């Protein structure tokens, strides 16, 4: 009979507040991004570049708060963030994604984003199709907020990211997180929702590796032309590559 210990309730309380401090459900800062343009050879590039950039900053802010992440070397902190960022952004975007019309609704019509907007940032269906698919199936899981923050933290603290030096340290942090999530589903997620829930969550992480790869490929294609690359941000260029 496994129970949620003091330490695990602590972990969940930390990740919740970490999330609360880094996700603004009023989407108030959006007014500062270069404006959206819907008429267009890549008319959404500057607005979504800015949105991703912002998102990167908030993902870093959440990552810093993960129990044990601070114990990592600054070089592994960097490796974990560079390789996970797009993945965590896809997961956190789920919170604003609506099955109503397969779009991301950030408060208002100007900041409601759909398939044609991502198209206009220079992405093709090779990515968008399995991206909506992902959002749809992650939405259907109906995670408790607790499961959502833990899935994001588990994604960031992955031992097999290329370039990891203290793999064994990354593993003990992540295992302490898996264990908290597994035990959590058991104690707090009632059936039929709880059924295979963990395995389905872990499967969304595998789906993320594939989306990551395809995002990277099209980002490398986008940033071929120094003219597109001009319209990104310094943080995007540093984190996604140059």
């Amino acid at each position: 009979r496994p129970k949620l210990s003091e330490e695990q309730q602590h972990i969940i309380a930390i990740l919740l507040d970490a999330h609360h401090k880094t996700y603004d459900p009023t989407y108030a800062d959006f007014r500062d991004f270069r404006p959206p343009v819907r008429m267009s050879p890549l008319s959404m590039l500057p607005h979504l570049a800015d949105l991703v950039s912002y998102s990167i900053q908030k993902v870093i802010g959440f990552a810093k708060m993960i129990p044990g992440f601070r114990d990592l070397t600054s070089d592994d902190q960097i490796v974990l963030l560079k390789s996970s960022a797009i993945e965590v952004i896809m997961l956190r975007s789920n919170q604003s994604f609506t099955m109503d019309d397969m779009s991301w609704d950030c408060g208002s019509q100007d900041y409601k984003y759909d398939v044609t907007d991502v198209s206009k940032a220079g992405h093709t269906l090779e990515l968008i199709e399995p991206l909506i698919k992902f959002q749809v199936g992650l939405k259907k899981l109906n995670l408790h907020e607790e499961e959502h923050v833990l899935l994001m933290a588990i994604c960031i603290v992955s031992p097999d990211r290329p370039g990891v030096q203290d793999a064994k340290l990354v593993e003990a942090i992540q295992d302490r997180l898996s264990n908290t999530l597994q035990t959590y589903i058991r104690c707090r997620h009632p059936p039929p929702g709880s059924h295979q829930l963990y395995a389905k969550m872990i499967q969304k992480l595998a789906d993320l590796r594939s989306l990551n790869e395809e995002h990277s490929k099209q980002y490398r294609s986008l940033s071929f032309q120094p003219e597109n690359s001009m319209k990104l941000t310094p943080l995007v260029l540093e984190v996604f590559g140059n």
Partner: peptide, 12 residues
């Protein structure tokens, strides 16, 4: 050297 901005956002 070569991730200044990311490094700075990570700092305590």
């Amino acid at each position: 050297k070569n991730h200044p901005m990311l490094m700075n956002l990570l700092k305590d």
